[PDB]
Amino acid sequence: NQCTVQVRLELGHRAQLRKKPTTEGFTHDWMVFVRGPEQCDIQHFVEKVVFWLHDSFPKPRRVCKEPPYKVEESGYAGFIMPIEVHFKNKEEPRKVCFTYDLFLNLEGNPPVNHLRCEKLTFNNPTTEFRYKLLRAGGVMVM
Numbered sequence: 001n002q003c004t005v006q007v008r009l010e011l012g013h014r015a016q017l018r019k020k021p022t023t024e025g026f027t028h029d030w031m032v033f034v035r036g037p038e039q040c041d042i043q044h045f046v047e048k049v050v051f052w053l054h055d056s057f058p059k060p061r062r063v064c065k066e067p068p069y070k071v072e073e074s075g076y077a078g079f080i081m082p083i084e085v086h087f088k089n090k091e092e093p094r095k096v097c098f099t100y101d102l103f104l105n106l107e108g109n110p111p112v113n114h115l116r117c118e119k120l121t122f123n124n125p126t127t128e129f130r131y132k133l134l135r136a137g138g139v140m141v142m
């Protein structure tokens with residue numbers, strides 16, 4: 001039969017000016033994450049999240065295979081971060097790719113506390129992957 005399942009992801013980041021910079025002239029702490037809304041376990045359908053940091057970072061490929069799906073770092077500039085959310089799906093789609101705007105607060109602006117809400121729509125998932133989406137607190141849309 002036909003069924004379409006929606007699940008929600010929240011991508012987000014925090015950034016703040018360090019009271020004093022680091023030795024390396026890193027002015028900021030930031031943290032970037034992927035999570036579910038309240039009372040959802042996205043781990044049921046998320047295999048892993050890959051955060052692609054700027055080439056300027058060492059081991060810039062950061063993999064979270066279980067919650068929390070987050071990177072914590074200090075740096076001196078914002079950048080565009082590819083974030084891959086890989087699914088426990090045996091068919092397409094196998095993952096989804098976001099271009100995350102990791103910007104910093106500059107010149108004594110308040111800390112950054114940003115959230116990006118994403119709705120994934122899966123058309124006619126397999127029985128297997130449909131279970132996982134539901135277990136995670138996904139919703140049928142018909």
Ligand SMILES: CCN(CC)Cc1ccc(CNC(=O)N2CCN(c3ncccn3)CC2)cc1
Pocket residue numbers: 024026054056057058074075076077078079
């Ligand atoms: C906005 C586009 N442009 C600048 C306008 C290029 C650019 C963007 C971001 C960055 C961020 N880079 C950074 O903050 N990092 C921290 C970690 N670093 C490090 N270095 C040694 C050991 C460990 N970590 C490397 C430097 C840079 C350039």
